[PDB]
Amino acid sequence: ERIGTLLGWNLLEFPKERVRELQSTAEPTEGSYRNILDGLVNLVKEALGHIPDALIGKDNVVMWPGSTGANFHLPGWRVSDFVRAPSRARTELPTSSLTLIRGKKVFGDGIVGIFPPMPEIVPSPNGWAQVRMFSRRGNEIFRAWKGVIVTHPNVKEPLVAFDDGYGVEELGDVLEIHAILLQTQFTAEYTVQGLYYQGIPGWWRYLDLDFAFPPDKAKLVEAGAPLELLYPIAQYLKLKGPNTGFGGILLSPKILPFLGLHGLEDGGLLAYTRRWRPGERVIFNRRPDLPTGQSAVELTYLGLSPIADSVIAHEGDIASTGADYDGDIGYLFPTPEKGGLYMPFHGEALHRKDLPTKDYESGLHRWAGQVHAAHILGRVEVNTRRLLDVAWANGEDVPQDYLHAATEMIQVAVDRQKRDIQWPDFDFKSVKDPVMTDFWRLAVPGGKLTPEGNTPAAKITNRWRAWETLDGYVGHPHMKNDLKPLASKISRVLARGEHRRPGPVLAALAFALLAPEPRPKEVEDLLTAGLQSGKRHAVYDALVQMGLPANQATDHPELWLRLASKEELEAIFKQLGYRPAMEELEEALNA
Amino acid sequence: TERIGTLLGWNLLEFPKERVRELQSTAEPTEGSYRNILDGLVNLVKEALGHIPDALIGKDNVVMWPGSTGANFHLPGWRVSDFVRAPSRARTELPTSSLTLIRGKKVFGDGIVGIFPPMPEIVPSPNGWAQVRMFSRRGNEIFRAWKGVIVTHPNVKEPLVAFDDGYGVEELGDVLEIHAILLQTQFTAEYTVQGLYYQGIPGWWRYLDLDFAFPPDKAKLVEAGAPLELLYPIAQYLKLKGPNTGFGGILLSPKILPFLGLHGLEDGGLLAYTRRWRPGERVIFNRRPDLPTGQSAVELTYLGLSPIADSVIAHEGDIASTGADYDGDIGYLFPTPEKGGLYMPFHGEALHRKDLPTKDYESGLHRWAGQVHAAHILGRVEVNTRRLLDVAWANGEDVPQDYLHAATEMIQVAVDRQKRDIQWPDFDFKSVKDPVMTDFWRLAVPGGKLTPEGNTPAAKITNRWRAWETLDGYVGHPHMKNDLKPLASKISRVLARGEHRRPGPVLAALAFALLAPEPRPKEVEDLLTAGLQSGKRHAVYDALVQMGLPANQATDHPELWLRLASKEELEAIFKQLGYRPAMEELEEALNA
Ligand SMILES: [Mg+2]
Ligand SMILES: [Mg+2]
């Protein structure tokens, strides 16, 4: 459940295709912006007569107080940054508890609290959380903070960075703290964008094929389920790099004295891992990866960070990446000499910070800017990658000027989500043909090797079929040529599982499993509901969640498979003479 | 959830309740009737398995047997019935070598089998209790087993087991496996119809009155000012109540006190985990079932706190007439007559049980037939005795003491026949064919407890409360019938106030007053769709409530919405719809 929600705010969401239709024609102009605002007004007005006061939104989502919800003493537009995020865990401290350290960016630009252990929002005594915090009384909120809270046993008193807050100087009689992201490490893989901007020569030679099964299906695989039950296997394919990095929350060395620790040498970094030794070089990375290559920089690892699951690095060292400490993830990869795929940036970053600023009139205008800028950001990003393909095909490079200009546009597009900045002069150079970037967008949507969430099992085989048609795309000759062995591997895996369908296995299971044990009326009722309405799967998800016993489900093999234990799975597969899926998949990999 | 036996690897089989009820239908206190039931039950099992497995046990419509797989008990087959059927609510394991084995039959009190250091795994309070089954085990063998109550206390340094109250062989396994079958709690302490018939003060019926009991989801509606329409039919939430309530706790022996490092207890006095009485105050002790003589209720002196939570401690000799022991029995304390209690203390103080030839049943199967058969007789004798009181009270007379004694004995043997093959005494049934007040009580207060066992469908509960209109149809004590008239009218006014106040229009109106449903997962859509189309709305809503759907997302299903909404949201919507709170209207009906 969202923050604003728990403050009683209203959440209305639109069909995402409405917003996407609006964005399709967006240009970096005033007239295009205008277009977006108009159509967004239409969506809201159609839904409830007027533009409610203090309304904010992002993409297809809109929220507003009314007077049913809590009230903010900050500009209307600013409040978007506080209401939309999920409250994953909450806690409250009396204003009287608090020590108010003074200075802007005192703990590091984005770190807002430094506290004693707090097992209510932070699992580690020496941990962190990304948070929103509110100084409130009743239904007032006078001052609010967004960013990171650090936790440590050497810290005696809750420290709060006062001047980093938003609102006005007065405080309530509480601090409510919502953790929007709980302490964790982050998967650290190379991305398509990063490989296009800073990848070593011939980086594509080091991509390989892998499988990722959700724990559900991992249990089947481990128990020796047959290939039939993984149909279509494409749903479980992923590319992988030759190694992975470290990923943790990015923190500032400015926190170290507040922990009773010493500072940190220039050019050096700490990280909560023993994978590097003091003295060794590492590649520091922070996303988005920018067209110049400046998102990846070489720094010296100098030892353990005091905070779990974190990277500590100086503002000056990571300025080119555009990083800060309000939730950014810091990734560390091995250097090229040590097997890394990202090359360190050398030289001249655009020294950006302070010039053509200006606020949005209102939450609504801010929302229109976000929606508008989001479209441009993608257009510039994709475009730059297409051009690199066109260039590489010829044997030329895209001029550095362009990469610098594209970068500045990207950075403004991100900025234009917060405030009303002037669009720089940018010539979107056309692209004639399908290029490899178009291929990459099919095969690896979003650019990340670990696929996100949602692709219907119906469409996913088509994605992995694209590897057949490499030769139809303009791009670098060695890239298209050297991808052929990986394309072949992919083809074999698909070919092995094509035509191996689950139907006969589910039918056999129904005959090999004992009669169902006696089950409550609730359960019979749901099961009846599912079958008569053709919504088995909703019913099954329910029953899985409600901890139904395996032996009560044997007349529903699909459901049974989700409740059975290791032992029961192993037994039934042996009884039916199945060859383990994995043996078949290894054979297809290695042929 | 999960029967001990199931966890021991035993097989189980429930049969339709009707197969059993049919055999019981014609049960008589004779060996021939017994053999009827046995032959019937034998058939039941054989239809399923083709044979009666070794070591089968059974109660009512449930049988278990170990088969190829189940734990092997070094105990007579018939005895295992008492260890394998009960629910396993919580479990631990102690190594044999941890235990101190105290010797002597009934050394901790008859029914108490263990005195232990605090054990949060099965007992919530450091000075609490659990009703348990304990098994001395090695691999698949169970050598010795105990049934009864465990007590824990901070003063107890080592786990103490009453070894000689164990059942089976003397060799121990290497683990003592403990299953809690009932967790520490107090128990509702209300007067019953049986208890009032047998021990009630003169005119006890005058002190019964009407009350409401809403389950928490309905109390939420009430407190927020829902309209009477949403309670339809109100009969669902009616109960009778007594003029006062007692204390109910687990019953423990004073023999535990030295083992807790405490001093003993004077004769004639009891301890309980309550401050409601002062040391010195007289109190009425009660143990169920209530027996026809009135001997289930006795006056004892309350002397102070019990060291154990949610418990009552009283002497074997003091409670003998009630037939109580300490293996899980519940002790109830009620105020004396002089202080507004409805139970009179027994003074005729003489049980004196005559000796009836008795021997062990031959097998679990024979014991099962034993309880099935005897459960029927027990029912018949107890109802019948109350009917006889109605007849006598109608004629201005009394049932003779001897009849009460004989009926009590029959009841006791009927209980005992569930354990062992005891001879039936000679008992003249002296049956009653005319409708008597006892028949009214069975309609109005099924089972005799004021707090209804709540498995009557909505469609039938109104008819139950309608029986209050029919008092003239029943022979019994003339003042009982006349004096119940005020209570009957009150019931009548409440039913009539809610009659024709149906929920439909209010549900329809909430659909039009609630905001649009905020966005919801697709599986929630699909579930709701499955419910609508299949006609299983309610199974879906039960699921969605349990999976904790937010109210926000259910506003187009008002029945579901009422189950999810907050106090604030309920109050708000009832105000906007102009409803009068059900409680104001209910109060008006009561007070008219
Ligand atoms: Mg940032
Ligand atoms: Mg007993």
Author numbering:
A (entry chain B): 4 to 594
B (entry chain A): 3 to 594
Authors' account:
Many bacterial and eukaryotic viruses with double-stranded DNA genomes in the realms Duplodnaviria and Varidnaviria encode homologs of cellular RNAPs (collectively denoted “two-barrel RNAPs”). The TMP-fused virion RNAP transcribes pre-early phage genes, including a gene that encodes another, non-virion RNAP, that transcribes early and some middle phage genes. Transcription by vRNAP and nvRNAP is directed by dissimilar AT-rich and GC-rich promoters, respectively, and the two phage RNAPs have distinct overall architectures, with the TMP-fused vRNAP being unusually flat and lacking the clamp domain.
Gp64 is a non-virion RNAP (nvRNAP) that may transcribe phage genes at later stages of infection. Heterologously produced gp64 also extended the RNA component of the scaffold in a template-dependent manner. The crystal structures of gp64 nvRNAP and one of its close homologs (gp62 of phage P74-26) were also determined at 2.7 Å and 2.4 Å resolution, respectively, and found to be essentially identical. The overall architectures of gp96 vRNAP and gp64 nvRNAP are markedly different. The gp64 nvRNAP structure resembles the structures of other two-barrel RNAPs and has a characteristic crab-claw-like architecture that includes the clamp domain. The non-virion RNAP has a crab-claw-like architecture. Gp64 is distributed along a much larger, 49 kbp region extending from the left end to the middle part of the genome (genes 1-77) and thus interacts not only with early but also with middle phage genes. The pre-early genes include the gene encoding nvRNAP gp64, which transcribes the early and some middle genes of the phage. We therefore propose that these motifs define phage promoters; gp96 vRNAP initiates transcription at the AT-rich promoters, whereas gp64 nvRNAP initiates transcription at the GC-rich promoters.
